Design a protein around this ligand. Structure first.
Ligand SMILES: *[B]([O])([O])[C]([C][C]([C])[C])[N]C(=O)[C]([C]C1=[C][C]=[C][C]=[C]1)[N]C(=O)C1=[C]N=[C][C]=N1
Ligand SMILES: *[B]([O])([O])[C]([C][C]([C])[C])[N]C(=O)[C]([C]C1=[C][C]=[C][C]=[C]1)[N]C(=O)C1=[C]N=[C][C]=N1
Ligand SMILES: *[B]([O])([O])[C]([C][C]([C])[C])[N]C(=O)[C]([C]C1=[C][C]=[C][C]=[C]1)[N]C(=O)C1=[C]N=[C][C]=N1
Ligand SMILES: *[B]([O])([O])[C]([C][C]([C])[C])[N]C(=O)[C]([C]C1=[C][C]=[C][C]=[C]1)[N]C(=O)C1=[C]N=[C][C]=N1
Ligand SMILES: *[B]([O])([O])[C]([C][C]([C])[C])[N]C(=O)[C]([C]C1=[C][C]=[C][C]=[C]1)[N]C(=O)C1=[C]N=[C][C]=N1
Ligand SMILES: *[B]([O])([O])[C]([C][C]([C])[C])[N]C(=O)[C]([C]C1=[C][C]=[C][C]=[C]1)[N]C(=O)C1=[C]N=[C][C]=N1
Ligand SMILES: *[B]([O])([O])[C]([C][C]([C])[C])[N]C(=O)[C]([C]C1=[C][C]=[C][C]=[C]1)[N]C(=O)C1=[C]N=[C][C]=N1
Ligand SMILES: *[B]([O])([O])[C]([C][C]([C])[C])[N]C(=O)[C]([C]C1=[C][C]=[C][C]=[C]1)[N]C(=O)C1=[C]N=[C][C]=N1
Ligand SMILES: *[B]([O])([O])[C]([C][C]([C])[C])[N]C(=O)[C]([C]C1=[C][C]=[C][C]=[C]1)[N]C(=O)C1=[C]N=[C][C]=N1
Lengths: 182, 182, 182, 182, 182, 182, 182, 182, 182
């Protein structure tokens, strides 16, 4: 990591209210992002915060924690898609404030349904299957809230993997603008 | 394996209409047992067949195949518990013809509910959980048929592992007689 | 393997025109089954042959070779489901001559669509995807031929895993009779 | 870890009397949390301390040490559920001072009974089983103290895995308030 | 294995009503021994059978199956200690008919209590501990039956490992005669 | 391997002048096939020999040895495709005598160019590349000789993997007849 | 890494508006490069930025993110080929502003088509193959935009691996100048 | 590890004359603890030192070194049980100055006899067994000195593992006070 | 193993009352040797038996079982040292009947004391050390009985490894004759 005499490049970016969400999303990544967001709200609760996303997905609880923290703080949040947005990435991209969700021209967006596993006795397996079913329902409700589509459309579009270009995702309601130059 | 000039000990026993079910029950064991039963029925459909059981359990499909083959052939079948009859083994012991199920004085019998696993997408997990639920119902129905207990008693007694001595298993309905000498 | 003074149990069964198809289906299993079928046709081309099936599935080419050999020889063929007929196994069970397909009362039958993989350059991936798609079409045509269902019903019923009891499979057209006793 | 010219993000948060309990709970995590709590009490024994929880569980002794340290110091303690609270997490969340336990709207809470193992001679196994039973009784007593439920309800609700949404956990007595915005 | 033109050495010995129990005792060993005993009873139910023991112990269920089979058949049984008799071996040596238990002059005999393990939830651990305790009681009862000692003496002598020479074991009641020459 | 009292199934088939070429082709397979062909020619040099092929391919030298031995002996040779013929298999299938090459209705045939590797110093790499190029030329010449196609068509058709149904392969010149029944 | 009293050599180079893209291109490399580009634009949006490339290639999404960020910022960008430029390297080298793409005299440039893989059910395989085909189309469009060649020439030249010297790549349109001295 | 601008949390605690003994006890842990104790004595030989214990045990020589260093220095020492004090840990807890040994209300204390191993020739094994026996005698003497119990009680109570709550350990003589609040 | 038309070489040798004890001595070797000795005694109780030894040693219980069986049967026994007689082997060589122990001119004989190990709690270690001490005493008594040396000489000579030529071993009392030709 290069240094700027004495910062590092990511701390220098954080001085400009910029947070990076890169790679797969797990508990360490989620805790780091949440700490940065809380610190930025502590500095000022009226200035916008910019989040750059390049992720293939990750764990449901970590992404839901990030989403809930984003909805909690009072600052307006802008989301920028650079590269990839799959699973929670595409859920985070759509979670920015209306009118402030952007993508670069050569990005890919992917949506699909959650996956998991069960093990043990039959009673245990029943309990775990019920848990994952209601988790799927909750995720679909969040998607329907932020894309302004209907529940039937969301259920139809997420049975299998679905890929989109920025124009297709803008038509779907995941994005607002596709930008070429500042 | 010792030989009897030229048989082996198991073929010499099979000459006396004796089949041995020892160790874990899998597809190879099931196919061997079924082939032996078909051969013995081909030799004669009126003479009794003796089955010695010492097993800790195994796969559901193999044991159900053995049970179905046992119910299909016309010969009367005697079952003998030597050492252990746990899980699928305890299902086979109770499947002999009425009045012909025996145990040795120092044997242990164990009953419990089936186990498994699920993996994949949410739809896949739902399908697999439904399959294992109806498997459990079918097994409970077989147990209730052969022990003359009610369905509620069977469901209560198999929530956890249950261990029994030969007298307790005779009172439950899994056995008819506990023998010390010929 | 027990011996009958000097045969083995499977050769003694083959003396009664009985062939066993047990376990996963691969090239060795297919070659053994085909050799036995050719030998039995060599002995006599007018007597029936009985095939017992307990399999979870296997490779497409081996199962298609077995199916083609079954359709080639002139002998009538009876199929017996003991325990499990899943994936390729369920294709063989339905391939017996009409009026001669049987199952035991506690068996499970499963149907679903084929799976595979692709690797390499984009042109190679396109070629392999085309190959697997036409493989799926051929398998669906065989199923529609032998179950007397329509192609739309077969396509709808095989998108996901589908499990069946002997009565359900008899209603579908995979079986003719469910037998309890000889 | 990003730095603030010179702190790290977690030390900058600790300057605001904020402690993070993230990931599995073991001895290192417990010692770090306890050291931070003692330092914060040293700075001031009248100001509130905030604890953010996102954990799947861990070891009983470490969590009990954290709980005892929380009950020892004189400062009021607020607990915040972000993401997940299972095993000790759900025990720690309920251990905050009354009126100061919060959750985010999309969190999951899980409760169940403890697990372990025994090995060795029969006398050793008896001793270890007695120890784990006493551990279970002590944990149930703590839960009953802090949720205001009866012991029978606690024992009934923890035989199997139990999952809860924030409203359900608020009704159970684990939480006081579910918050959307500051 | 050397051959006697065509037998092997163990089948040649079995022609003289001699059964060898060597090495650790598991399910395969138990099934082989039981098959040989049943065959020898089939040949004649009035002639003595000789059993040579050199074993360090093994599994409880297999040894109890062997013991029950020995007590079931009508033939008198002689036991010969060559080298070692520990755990189940020392249980089998004492199980011969009175007046027919022998040892070689330089053998070692060892007695101790059983061992095991438990795993899982607290209820499971309680069930497993209860099972192993009643197993210990059953083994102690068998020892007291065949050695003519009191239960308190047996419990006192088996808390730790106890080693014995043939004269000490003869005084204890495990043996009848120590022989130097035929 | 089943036995016919005393042959094995493959020796029983060899008594009917049937040779099986199954699985991958390597030096052991080639040696066995060549030995069988020489023995069958020794028995009689005027009777036809039947070869059943189910292979995914293999090594060039072994397949070329089999091809040369097939062209050497004086007996007419029939080839039968059951299941699969890829790489050398498709080369072997086309090598039968004209009018005697058959396939089953559901078989797949595949053709492509050879593959290899080079290593070492630059001079060594040049030598090895020259060797593989002339190997390719020789294989193409054999294909052109036996299919009656032009060299340009063969080079065009084998740049990438090419798959074929029995009717397409009959049109190409690899086969003579597609048979459903004897 | 040597230090310049307190910088490191790469931070000292970054003080001169120099960014290094060395080794394989993955998500970490892409995020670091993008952060450096954003910081350099923050310092000044009118001064040129120099990018040195020595890479064998990498992942498509990371390289496309770097390319999109390069086209977004307003600064003129010079590209310098030192050593190797294969896959995305050659795509990045051609993406500099016209008249500002340079190479050293002994460098190698390579172009080819993308590669990947597919797995799962047939529907999944179809979806993934469609995705990789449209990815190839997008890459070809970018190449045709920046080299001023026609689409047919680009598709012809990328079927196999193609190697070029700096003069050949200058004639192709990937470069403007080959320099020996400043 | 969090920092306090510039200390770490453990150095900040050491500024308050607090030493932490956490985790298993080995030579590195012992050397660190002894160095801290010597430094604290060098700062002042009249002020109390506080030691917090959460350990499952460890090596005998390291713990005896810590014990001897504690008895050597002139400062009064307070011991605090948080979570766990087992094996060597329970020896250190009892080693504090009279009237200054505390525990938290939910801690567990465990006592038992030492363990080891021997290997080699018979003379070596005799020497090593003698060494471990006198080690046991020395440990028992230390326990009897600090708990004010008799040697017979100590030997009777340590044959097997013995578990204690803080009240039971206070009755035994290991502790002075159980505290809920400061 | 070569065959003599149909024996093997070892069975052909056993036809001449020759037993081979080669390689390390363990339970399988001991059981085979004992079975052969019992068979040879069954054939005739007055003819001599010849035993050829080439062994580096082994387990104490197996060798003591062989020694006890050797002293039990009534036949005279000749021992022949070919190559090596070390540890247990040297104990068997000296165990032949007086006047019938021979060696080849270039053999090596080695004597030393037994080795072992102990593990566990201190009481267990004491018990195991006592057991190995009495084992050593019993072995020394056997050596003193068969060599006609005093116990002090045996104790002095086996503290360390001791090597001997046939003449030295004859002087020590392990052998009677060193032979060059029949
Ligand atoms: B995506 O592939 O990242 C996708 C999320 C999308 C549907 C919003 N991920 C998941 O569904 C993950 C996959 C996963 C499983 C196991 C470990 C890590 C990631 N699912 C879960 O995290 C999960 C957790 N609990 C239950 C069910 N699924
Ligand atoms: B027992 O252990 O024999 C028991 C059967 C009893 C309830 C009559 N066996 C099972 O429940 C087995 C356990 C197992 C799982 C996986 C591999 C091998 C054995 N269950 C199954 O075989 C099974 C199969 N399909 C679905 C669910 N469970
Ligand atoms: B089933 O599991 O028996 C099923 C066949 C059913 C649809 C009639 N099998 C397959 O789909 C197999 C799975 C498999 C993959 C790889 C190795 C072994 C088995 N598919 C294939 O064999 C296959 C072969 N070539 C291309 C695609 N799929
Ligand atoms: B949860 O799953 O984290 C749960 C705690 C809940 C009941 C308050 N955990 C446990 O019960 C743990 C599981 C575990 C076992 C072994 C290592 C780590 C974690 N149990 C224990 O820590 C434990 C310790 N001693 C005895 C029994 N159980
Ligand atoms: B001995 O050590 O062989 C002894 C037998 C003696 C007490 C009559 N053996 C056991 O106690 C065995 C040890 C063992 C454990 C696990 C695998 C193999 C052997 N115990 C058991 O077999 C056993 C089985 N179920 C429960 C408890 N113990
Ligand atoms: B096919 O895939 O089986 C194919 C043959 C076809 C062109 C008639 N096989 C080959 O080309 C084989 C692949 C292979 C490589 C290495 C080990 C085993 C198989 N090629 C060769 O055998 C080979 C040998 N020497 C040089 C070049 N290629
Ligand atoms: B080159 O070899 O680096 C080349 C890129 C060129 C065509 C612009 N690379 C790829 O095509 C990579 C290869 C790769 C595969 C897997 C992991 C890492 C690298 N392809 C991809 O990244 C890719 C991604 N998704 C779909 C298809 N291909
Ligand atoms: B306890 O677990 O802390 C306990 C000490 C207690 C009796 C005061 N420890 C031991 O007994 C240790 C166990 C151990 C063995 C090997 C490595 C690490 C730990 N014993 C010894 O350290 C030991 C050392 N030398 C001889 C014998 N035992
Ligand atoms: B020698 O190597 O043959 C020798 C015996 C000699 C003194 C007459 N052997 C032993 O001392 C063996 C070594 C050994 C140890 C462990 C496994 C195998 C071999 N000793 C024992 O067998 C043994 C057994 N129980 C206790 C002590 N030693």
């Amino acid at each position: 990591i290069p240094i700027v005499v004495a910062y590092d490049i990511y701390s220098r970016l954080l001085r400009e209210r910029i947070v990076c969400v890169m790679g797969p999303i797990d508990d360490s990544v989620a805790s780091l992002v949440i700490a940065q967001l809380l610190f930025l709200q502590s500095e000022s609760n009226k200035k916008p915060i910019h989040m750059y996303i390049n992720s293939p997905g990750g764990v449901v609880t970590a992404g839901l924690a990030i989403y809930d923290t984003m909805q909690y703080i009072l600052n307006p949040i802008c989301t920028w898609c650079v590269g990839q947005a799959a699973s929670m990435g595409s859920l985070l991209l759509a979670a920015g404030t209306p009118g402030m969700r952007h993508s670069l021209p050569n990005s890919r967006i992917m949506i699909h349904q959650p996956s998991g596993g069960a093990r043990g006795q039959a009673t245990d397996i029943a309990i775990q299957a019920e848990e994952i079913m209601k988790l799927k329902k909750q995720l679909y409700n969040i998607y329907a809230k932020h894309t302004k589509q209907s529940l039937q459309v969301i259920e139809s579009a997420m049975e299998r993997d679905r890929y989109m270009s920025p124009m297709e995702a803008q038509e779907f309601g995941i994005l607002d603008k596709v930008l070429v130059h500042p």
